[PDB]
Amino acid sequence: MRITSTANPRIKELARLLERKHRDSQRRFLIEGAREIERALQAGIELEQALVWEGGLNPEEQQVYAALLALLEVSEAVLKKLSVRDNPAGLIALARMPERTLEEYRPSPDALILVAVGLEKPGNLGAVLRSADAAGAEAVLVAGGVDLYSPQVIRNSTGVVFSLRTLAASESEVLDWIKQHNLPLVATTPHAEALYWEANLRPPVAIAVGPEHEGLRAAWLEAAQTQVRIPMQGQADSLNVSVSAALLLYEALRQRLL
DSSP, X not given: OEEOOTTSHHHHHHHGGGSHHHHHHHTEEXXXXXXXXXXXXXXXXXXXXXXXXXXXXXXXXXXXXXXXXXXXEEOHHHHHHHOOSSSOOSXXXXXXXXXXXXXXXXXXXXXXXXXXXXXXXXXXXHHHHHHHHXXXXXXXEEESOOOTTOHHHHHHTTTGGGXXXXXXXXXXXXXXXXXXXXXXXXXXXXXXXXXXXGSOOOXXXXXXXXXXXXXXXXXXXXXXXXXXXXXXXXXXXXXXHHHHHHHHHHHHHHHHTO
């Protein structure tokens, strides 16, 4: 009926989904937020149950709730237990981990690709995917492991992870892939002479960015057709990777509209 105790066995089972091993073995994950839940539905993700704040839902959460499966009227302390936000949504769903399709990818003639190197933080991963989605990137190639169903990747990407082609592989594997398709590569580095605005970001192209507290290894710089930098005008020595990815990708979008 109305579950208010975090000790409730049903809630103890769902809380385990906050950890990766548990999501993978059970092929299930939580989706917090009416918009995230909706985008998941729009992507074909099957839901099994939805939890609802006993104190009511906001308008948006109400229309998502309408467009729906066992339901659970739940308390704030319980949603907070399943939440990864300061203030939890009023609607959290239990989802089935999708049928991981092993389809291969080949860049189209309009391909705008973002290559993220040294990106290990799920929060950062999500923010980066959000910037790549907004700019219109065709894919995000992550050189270094990815977890598409974690709560932080889902929140920071605002659900975009359910639709943006995001792939992982070793740096060597990704680099061999680039050359395999004769895909021009533009590497970002603070010591490059050319400003990023001067590079030619014509439709078929890949843009690499490294960690914010570090540059791209020599391997990436020797493989690039062009090396470029994002000018820093003040005290800051760097920017969050999601901000850098937006800058480079929006400049690509600006050149395309020309």
